[PDB]
């Protein structure tokens, strides 16, 4: 079953406008293989990822997830972004953490220009439990059962400097891939769209 | 201790004429701050020796 897992599949989509303040939170990523937000109107289908179908037939999941953020700039769109993973569970007030407070956590920066445009972010396995239950199968919150090993805010680390004959915004695809992935305790569950 | 802390950030414009002082920032005093990770090593200590890596 490692075929539909390691191949990067689009999980989310967010742009990056030039009219934003430095340090403004763009989009958080709840770090789990269960995450997807796309759909389609022709045909009427909720777009799953190929990793979200493998792990949804299990209780527990474990593995070093590799997020691949493919920006689509020109060569001259300049600036940098911040992909700051904050571990723990799916629910902490990470929106209240300031940008310089987010410099305490380990993270990475990426120049929008350059000769490449995709950053492979290998998420560490940071959890209190050695696995993580499919709490989406259940319908109740409980301290001890959770869904994610942490969240991942895309910050505005630098502004987007560009001329007027190019675009004012650069869109970022969120690929979903992994390495050393393990799941057990099988079940059947259809996942629902994380509506952010 | 060896992890980069964003101690300052600015925005340089066109209206700043030649040799205008855009930023006047202190190095170690902005490092000694509660919102960073080195506060857990500098609050319980008083006298220190260190080298500064600016990026």
């Amino acid at each position: 079953f490692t075929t539909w897992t390691s191949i990067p599949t689009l999980a989310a989509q967010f742009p990056f406008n030039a009219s934003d303040s430095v340090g403004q939170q763009i989009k958080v990523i709840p770090v789990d293989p269960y995450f997807f937000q796309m759909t389609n109107t022709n045909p009427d289908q909720k777009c799953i990822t190929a990793l979200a179908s493998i792990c949804q037939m299990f209780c527990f999941w474990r593995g070093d997830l590799v997020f691949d953020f493919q920006v689509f700039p020109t060569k001259y769109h300049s600036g940098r972004l911040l992909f700051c993973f904050v571990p723990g569970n799916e629910l902490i007030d990470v929106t209240g953490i300031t940008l310089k407070q987010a410099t305490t956590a380990p993270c990475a920066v990426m120049d929008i220009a350059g000769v490449q445009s995709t950053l492979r972010f290998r998420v560490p396995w940071i959890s209190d439990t050695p696995y993580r239950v499919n709490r989406y199968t259940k319908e109740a919150h409980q301290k001890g059962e959770y869904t994610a090993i942490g969240k991942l805010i895309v910050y505005c680390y630098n502004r987007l400097t560009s001329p007027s004959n190019v675009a004012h915004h650069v869109r970022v695809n969120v690929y979903l891939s992994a390495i050393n992935l393990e799941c057990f305790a099988p079940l059947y569950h259809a996942m629902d769209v994380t509506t952010q | 201790g060896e992890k980069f802390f964003l101690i300052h950030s600015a925005r340089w414009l066109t209206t700043h004429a030649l040799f205008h002082e855009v930023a006047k920032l202190d190095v170690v005093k902005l490092l000694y701050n509660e919102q960073f990770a080195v506060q857990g090593l500098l609050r319980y200590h008083t006298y220190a020796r260190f080298g500064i890596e600016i990026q």
């Epitope: 303040s21 340090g23 007030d93 929106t95 209240g96 940008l99 | 600015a10 925005r11």
Partner: antibody, heavy 121, light 107 residues
Framework: EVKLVESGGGLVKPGGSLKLSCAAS????????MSWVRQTPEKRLEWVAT????????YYPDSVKGRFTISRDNARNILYLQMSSLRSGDTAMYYC??????????????WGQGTTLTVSS | DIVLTQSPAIMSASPGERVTMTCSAH?????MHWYQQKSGTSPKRWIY???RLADAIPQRFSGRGSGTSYSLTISSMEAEDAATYYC?????????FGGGTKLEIKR
Amino acid sequence: EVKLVESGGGLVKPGGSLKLSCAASMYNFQHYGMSWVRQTPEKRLEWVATIQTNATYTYYPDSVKGRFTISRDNARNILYLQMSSLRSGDTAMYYCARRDNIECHYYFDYWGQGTTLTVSS
Amino acid sequence: DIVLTQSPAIMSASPGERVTMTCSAHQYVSYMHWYQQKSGTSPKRWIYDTSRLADAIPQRFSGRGSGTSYSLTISSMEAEDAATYYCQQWQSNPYTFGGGTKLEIKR
């Protein structure tokens, strides 16, 4: 475009209760902290309430701590500012704000059109 | 707790000259944020942390000063600034604003 439409306000006797509501538009709800800014016609301004994305954290000043209640909803994306024990100190224009993050401090980006609550009997 | 003090209360200036307003406090605040309350509408994105203008206003404005004094340097006055200004802190609990700076046009 941010369309923050307040709802509420009018003629409420002092000591009464009235709940406000500010709806979000075209942008994500689980990031941007929502607030309320009171606009008195003579002086100002006093800042009253904020509950964040997770509903655990509330931040009130010395004055309106415990008398006003701000709430958020992930389903409708509409605020709920429940007010009680009003008087002439709150007879003003009410705006709803949206608080995002900068390097050291925060900022309120986009504000609404504002509704009028007159508190007298 | 802490109270912000704006020294220009009511000012009127001809279009095409330099205007500087100042918001101070009784203690030391780090960064100061500004707004513009036009008639009939609400304040929008105007000024963030120290010299960080908005991304939709013209760039003929500036903001300097640290510690006590906080100058907002206007390079060239124009006919679009007939409104009321406020200054914002982000230190301790009440998050108070300034008393109000009404800048107008001299005729």
